Amino acid sequence: QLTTESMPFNVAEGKEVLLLVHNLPQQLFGYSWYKGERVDGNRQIVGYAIGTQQATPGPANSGRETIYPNASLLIQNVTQNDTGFYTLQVIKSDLVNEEATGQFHVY
Amino acid sequence: QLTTESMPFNVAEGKEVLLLVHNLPQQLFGYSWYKGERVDGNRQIVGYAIGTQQATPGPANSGRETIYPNASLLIQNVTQNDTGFYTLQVIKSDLVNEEATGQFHVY
């Protein structure tokens, strides 16, 4: 049931897009966002620990993103290579974790 | 650097296999094991929270597996459909998580 929608879907180069999260579960340890349609550490954008409120960037961090405490992801100054899928993984306290995929298109 | 090796690699139907974990990082919240070569909640075997020492089964749990506190995974009474890839994800305190893939073959 966790979902993400991009706002806007079609984004103009140089403008911004918000990946808005819906149905965020409770009893969470943290968030991890990835570029592409799969959880993979080689393409992690950012890790975020809820208790300490610490964001840590990953290999796919571009320096134009902001993760908020509700797990939504802002990307500013979009370029053509931002186009595609993004994957949010949410880590539950029982370690039975949940993923959701979003997407947007830069024109 | 996290890795997993199956012992034995080639496993006889009805016998057991241990997915032994190496280089387990420190400062971990938990473990999640998956069937297949990717982290995906629809194929989660088990979630394990280190602090409370609780295992919770996922959709791909067969009832023949045991995860230990060092993250190694025993599978007993193997069948032909156990053949293939397994994926361990390790959740770090900074949420910049690590994955490793193992495999074995049932003959």
Author numbering:
A (entry chain A), B (entry chain A): 1 to 107
Please give me the paper's original passages concerning this structure.
Like other hCEACAM family members, the hCEACAM1 IgV domain serves as the major ligand binding surface and is characterized by the presence of two anti-parallel β-sheets creating two distinct faces, the GFCC′ and ABED faces, respectively. The major mode of hCEACAM1 binding is homophilic such that it exists on the cell surface as collections of monomers and cis-dimers. hCEACAM1 has also been shown to form higher-order homo-oligomers and micro-clusters which, when present in a trans-configuration have been hypothesized to be important for strength of signal transduction.
To understand the structural basis for higher-order oligomerization and clustering of hCEACAM1, we solved the crystal structure of a tagless hCEACAM1 IgV domain at 2.2 Å resolution. Taken together, this oligomer crystal structure revealed simultaneous interactions through a primary (GFCC’-GFCC’) and secondary (ABED-ABED) contact at an atomic resolution level thus demonstrating the presence of two adhesion sites on a single hCEACAM1 IgV molecule. Notably, molecule (b) showed an additional interaction site involving the ABED surface with an interface area of 482.1 Å2 which was mediated by interactions with molecule (a) through residues located at its respective ABED face. The residues Q26 of molecule (b) and I67 of molecule (a) mediated two hydrogen-bond interactions and formed the central site for the formation of the ABED face, wherein the side-chain atoms NE2 and OE1 of molecule (b) residue Q26 made two hydrogen-bonds of 3.0 Å and 3.1 Å with the main chain oxygen and nitrogen atoms of molecule (a) residue I67, respectively. In contrast to the GFCC’ interface, the ABED interface did not involve hydrophobic interactions. Interestingly, molecule (b) residue S93, which is located within the FG loop, made a side-chain to backbone hydrogen-bond interaction of 2.8 Å through molecule (a) residue G63. Specifically, we observed that the GFCC’-based interface in this structure exhibited twice the area of the ABED interface. Consistent with the central role of GFCC’ face in dimerization and subsequent oligomerization, we observed GFCC’ face mediated interactions between two oligomers that enabled the formation of higher-order oligomers, wherein molecule (a) of the oligomer present in the crystal asymmetric unit mediated GFCC’ face interactions with a symmetry mate of molecule a (as) of the symmetry-related second oligomer. We therefore determined the crystallographic Debye-Waller factor (temperature factor or B factor) of all three molecules of the human CEACAM1 crystal structure reported here.
